[PDB]
Amino acid sequence: ARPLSELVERGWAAALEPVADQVAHMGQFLRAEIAAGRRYLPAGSNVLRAFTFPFDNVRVLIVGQDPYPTPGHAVGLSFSVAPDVRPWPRSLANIFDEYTADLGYPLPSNGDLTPWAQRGVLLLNRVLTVRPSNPASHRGKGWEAVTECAIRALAARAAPLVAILWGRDASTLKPMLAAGNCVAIESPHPSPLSASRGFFGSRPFSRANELLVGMGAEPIDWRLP
């Protein structure tokens, strides 16, 4: 489609109003991509899914990168995969261990994160689409401008926000949320290569919550089994 209000929750309409031209453009890029014979992975419907849940109800940002490059895996949301996805992304596996370690909970039955999303945890990738099997193929391709505005908008609100930033790529957005009512908690990426380097033990789910409570807001549920 075309007009922002028909594409995202409104309130998100407001949020992203300044990147309307920029997002609309992203469309004809994608369309142009199919036109040239190649497809993009995130999946028509889900591309902007991140922005389908209320803007004013977000309390936690988990910024990812671009989508999982393998078909049927990427689902429109950071780090989350589809429930049928069996041997799951090792990053996600690690996230989950710290998740059981951090909170009393038992290991999730699948890497389907939808419930977090619908509870005010915004799983926003920095790049919303990607060519199949070709990781990072849509970097600088226009998306960052959008996801960036997304974030700035969240920061501007009266409501408190916790941003958890996994990896240095993420950290570059620290300045981008002027920490007035925003708190950022950074750590090395849950990827296997770096996880034990300081992600594990970072306790981000509870800390995020305690931070939220510290600021007079409601904690996230987490908890998905």
Partner: protein, 82 residues
Amino acid sequence: NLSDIIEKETGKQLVIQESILMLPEEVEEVIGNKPESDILVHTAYDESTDENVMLLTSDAPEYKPWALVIQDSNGENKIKML
């Protein structure tokens, strides 16, 4: 695939599930070789040896091999520079 070069250096039919991008500063600490520019950490999982198989390559367009890491159930890494 780029997963073929995994199959080459190890002989294991595995699917890459994620490519995380990191800065030299991040990669150096773990492997002890500061790389030129950023790296993508393509991680596949071997569900039989319980090993995390990692392929580190140069950024998006040219996916140039740089190093390979095999990480066991304990966490120790057999690093082979490529």
